[PDB]
Amino acid sequence: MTEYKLVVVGAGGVGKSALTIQLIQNHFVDEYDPTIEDSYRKQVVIDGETCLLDILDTAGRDQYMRTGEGFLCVFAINNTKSFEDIHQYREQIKRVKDSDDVPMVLVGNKCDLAARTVESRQAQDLARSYGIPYIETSAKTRQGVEDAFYTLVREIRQHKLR
Numbered sequence: 001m002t003e004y005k006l007v008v009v010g011a012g013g014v015g016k017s018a019l020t021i022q023l024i025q026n027h028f029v030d031e032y033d034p035t036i037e038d039s040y041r042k043q044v045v046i047d048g049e050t051c052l053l054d055i056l057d058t059a060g061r062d063q064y065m066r067t068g069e070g071f072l073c074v075f076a077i078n079n080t081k082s083f084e085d086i087h088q089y090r091e092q093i094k095r096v097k098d099s100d101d102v103p104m105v106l107v108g109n110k111c112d113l114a115a116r117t118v119e120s121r122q123a124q125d126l127a128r129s130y131g132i133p134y135i136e137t138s139a140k141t142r143q144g145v146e147d148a149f150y151t152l153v154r155e156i157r158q159h160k161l162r
């Protein structure tokens with residue numbers, strides 16, 4: 001079985017744990033200890049291929065960035081600061097990876113909220129500038145969660161095939 005090492009990064013509070021748990025347990029967890037950092041695994045079928053996702057839920061290290069094959073760069077659509085922090089996360093990943101093109105997906109979480117401060121178009125354009133996909137999600141309603149992680153796996157698959 002093919003294993004995919006995924007790393008979820010982003011400012012505190014954007015919903016990294018909630019996203020990971022929703023994927024794994026299919027339910028919305030709030031108030032999850034913000035200081036806990038661990039990896040979660042799930043065997044799934046993506047595009048006819050059975051694989052094992054190994055997801056590191058970061059809490060805030062080039063060590064794990066080095067081992068990671070793909071990265072979910074998450075920000076919250078109602079927190080502009082988390083969006084601008086994306087640049088820094090991507091720079092760190094590229095730095096330790098010594099590569100210009102590392103599998104990455106820009107995730108705009110909390111799309112269920114009405115008070116949006118980051119427009120989808122802004123993120124879309126930034127992602128396009130980075131050459132990566134942009135996917136809006138909601139760990140609360142689960143909208144786009146599977147899309148986010150599965151898209152990253154496909155990015156990794158394509159990266160490996162090159």
Ligand SMILES: Nc1nc2c(ncn2[C@@H]2O[C@H](COP(=O)(O)OP(=O)(O)O)[C@@H](O)[C@H]2O)c(=O)[nH]1
Nearest residue numbers: 012013014015016017018030031110138139140
């Ligand atoms: N409305 C809404 N709140 C969310 C969503 N995802 C996470 N949260 C809330 O945001 C807070 C932080 O989430 P958490 O997963 O702990 O953030 P992290 O620090 O990135 O791991 C919690 O209070 C969650 O309940 C979401 O999609 N929608």
